[PDB]
C-alpha cells in the first residue's frame, strides 16, 4: 500500500497566498518526480509543476509560471507547492501525484485533492428564493415544487428538503458562479401534485465553512 | 505545449459492451500518453502508461493500442464501474498538458423529460430584476437544451443554463435554464417561452406565459 | 547450424510478447522475434531468485 495524503487547502483573499503540502507513506520520493496538478470546478485536470526528487530542478506550467513555486523533501518524505499571489483564476482543487524519473511516465499514483478558493467575495452566505410548481395537467399526473439557493461564496453548499427528512423525489444541481462573485444552485421536489399542499417542503441549504444555514419554506403560489 | 484533441465527445454503451476513446497529440509525443479515470469525490487513478502498459491495481478490460499516429483506450467490456469520463496526458516532455476528456454513458432508454415553467412573480420582481425559469426532470440521455423566445422570435446572448449530475440508478439527469432580464427589460415583452429540445423527445415542449402571469 | 540461447528478465503480463508476429512495448521496442521464427520461448516466475 502507498499513500498521498494532502493538506492544507482553505479560502484565500486576491493577491494573497497558500502553502500545500503531500506526504509520503509506503514509498519514498527519491528517483520519482513529485507532481501538482489543478482541476479548477467543472473542468478536467491542468499541469502546475514537477520536481525530480533525486534532483532538485523543476519545471513549470505556463499557466502557474512566475507565480508558484514547488519543492520535496527526502527527509520528510513529504511534497509541497506554495501558491503567491493567488487570484479568482485560481480556484481550483489541487492534487498531487508521482511518476518515475524526470518525465515520460504518467502519474500513477494520485492524493485525493484539497480545494482553495479565491474571489472578490471572500464569502457570503446563501438566500433562498421560491419556485412555483405548475398548476396545468402534467404527464404522470406529478408536480414539483423548488428553489433557487443564491448568492453565497465558497462551494460547496449541502441542499435537502423537510430538514433532511425528504430525500425522496429531491433533485439538486451543483452551484455555478454568477457575476456577483458568489455561487448559485437550484433544486425541486418531484411527487403526485396533490402531495404539494400535504407535505412539508422546506429547502435546507447548508454550508459548514461560515457556520451557517437556511431553512426556506417553499409553497404553491396561487396562480 | 502539445494539445491533445479527444473524440467522440461522449460516448452511449451499454453494460457488457465494448468502448473505444481515441486521443489525437498535436505533435510528436511518442509513446508517453497516459490515460486517467476519475470518480466524483475522488483522485484520477491511472489507468494505462507509456501508452499500452496496464498500470497496478487496474482491471486487465483497459486496454489499448496504436496505428500510425492513433492512440485508443479500449475498455473490453463495461462494467458498472467503467462510466467516467476519461483523460489523456502527455508525458514525454514538459509542459504536461492534459486534454478535455470524454464522458461514457450507460445508453439507457431514451425519454423526454417532465417539464415545468416559472414565470417571474410579483415577489421575484420586487428586486428590480426578472428571472424566467424552466426545469427539465428526470430524462436521458445527457445531451439537451433550451430553445428561448420572445413574441414567438429567437432569443439570444440572454440565458444561462445549469446541468446537474446523473442519478446513481438510472442515470437520469435535469437540466436547468433561465432567461436574465432587468424589470425594465422584462416591461418590454408579451409573450415567453421555453422550447424543450432532445434525442427523446419527438415533439419539442413548448412551455409559456404572458408577462405577469404567475 | 546454430542454435542461440537468448534471455532477459520480465513481468508476468510480457511473457505473452515474447513470440514472432507481435506487438506492445518489448515486441516493438526491446526484442523481437521474425515471422517466418524456428524455435521455442520458455519463461518462468523467479520471484524467490
Known amino acids: 500500500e502507498v499513500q498521498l495524503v494532502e493538506s492544507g487547502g482553505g479560502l484565500v483573499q486576491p493577491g494573497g497566498s497558500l502553502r500545500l503540502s503531500c506526504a509520503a507513506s509506503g514509498f519514498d520520493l527519491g528517483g520519482y518526480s513529485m507532481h501538482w496538478v489543478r482541476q479548477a470546478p467543472g473542468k478536467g485536470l491542468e499541469w502546475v509543476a514537477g520536481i525530480y526528487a533525486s534532483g532538485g530542478a523543476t519545471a513549470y506550467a505556463d499557466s502557474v509560471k512566475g507565480r508558484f513555486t514547488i519543492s520535496a523533501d527526502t527527509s520528510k518524505n513529504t511534497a509541497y507547492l506554495q501558491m503567491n499571489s493567488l487570484r479568482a483564476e485560481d480556484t481550483a482543487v489541487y492534487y498531487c501525484a508521482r511518476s518515475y524519473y524526470y518525465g515520460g511516465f504518467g502519474m500513477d499514483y494520485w492524493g485525493q485533492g484539497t480545494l482553495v478558493t479565491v474571489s472578490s467575495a471572500s464569502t457570503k452566505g446563501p438566500s433562498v428564493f421560491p419556485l412555483a410548481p405548475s398548476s396545468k395537467s402534467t404527464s404522470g399526473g406529478t408536480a414539483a415544487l423548488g428553489c433557487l439557493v443564491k448568492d453565497y461564496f465558497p462551494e460547496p453548499v449541502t441542499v435537502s428538503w423537510n430538514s433532511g427528512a425528504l430525500t425522496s423525489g429531491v433533485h439538486t444541481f451543483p452551484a455555478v458562479l454568477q457575476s456577483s462573485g458568489l455561487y448559485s444552485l437550484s433544486s425541486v421536489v418531484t411527487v403526485p401534485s396533490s402531495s404539494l399542499g400535504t407535505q412539508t417542503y422546506i429547502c435546507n441549504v447548508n454550508h459548514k465553512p461560515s457556520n451557517t444555514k437556511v431553512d426556506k419554506k417553499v409553497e404553491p403560489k396561487s396562480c | 505545449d502539445i494539445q491533445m484533441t479527444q473524440s467522440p465527445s461522449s460516448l452511449s454503451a451499454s453494460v457488457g459492451d465494448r468502448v473505444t476513446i481515441t486521443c489525437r497529440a498535436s505533435?510528436?509525443?511518442?509513446?508517453?500518453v497516459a490515460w486517467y479515470q476519475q470518480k466524483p469525490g475522488k483522485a484520477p487513478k491511472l489507468l494505462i502508461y507509456?501508452?499500452?502498459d496496464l498500470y497496478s491495481g487496474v482491471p486487465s478490460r483497459f486496454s489499448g493500442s496504436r496505428s500510425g499516429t492513433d492512440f485508443t483506450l479500449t475498455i473490453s467490456s463495461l462494467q458498472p464501474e467503467d462510466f467516467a469520463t476519461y483523460y489523456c496526458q502527455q508525458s514525454h516532455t514538459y509542459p504536461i498538458t492534459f486534454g478535455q476528456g470524454t464522458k461514457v454513458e450507460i445508453k439507457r432508454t431514451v425519454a423526454a423529460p417532465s417539464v415545468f415553467i416559472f414565470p417571474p412573480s410579483d415577489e421575484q420582481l420586487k428586486s428590480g430584476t426578472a428571472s424566467v425559469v424552466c426545469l427539465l426532470n428526470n430524462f436521458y440521455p445527457r445531451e439537451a437544451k433550451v430553445q428561448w423566445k420572445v413574441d414567438n422570435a429567437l432569443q439570444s446572448g440572454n440565458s444561462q443554463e445549469s446541468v446537474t449530475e446523473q442519478d446513481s440508478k438510472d442515470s437520469t439527469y435535469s437540466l436547468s435554464s433561465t432567461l436574465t432580464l432587468s424589470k425594465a427589460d422584462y416591461e418590454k415583452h408579451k409573450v415567453y417561452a421555453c422550447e424543450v429540445t432532445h434525442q427523446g423527445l419527438s415533439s419539442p415542449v413548448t412551455k409559456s406565459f404572458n408577462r405577469g402571469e404567475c | 547450424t546454430n542454435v542461440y540461447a537468448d534471455s532477459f528478465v520480465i513481468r508476468g503480463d510480457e511473457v505473452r510478447q515474447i513470440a514472432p508476429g507481435q506487438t506492445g512495448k518489448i515486441a516493438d521496442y526491446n526484442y523481437k522475434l521474425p515471422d517466418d521464427f524456428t524455435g521455442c520461448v520458455i519463461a518462468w516466475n523467479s520471484n524467490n531468485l
Open positions: 505533435q510528436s509525443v511518442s509513446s508517453a
Open positions: 507509456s501508452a499500452s
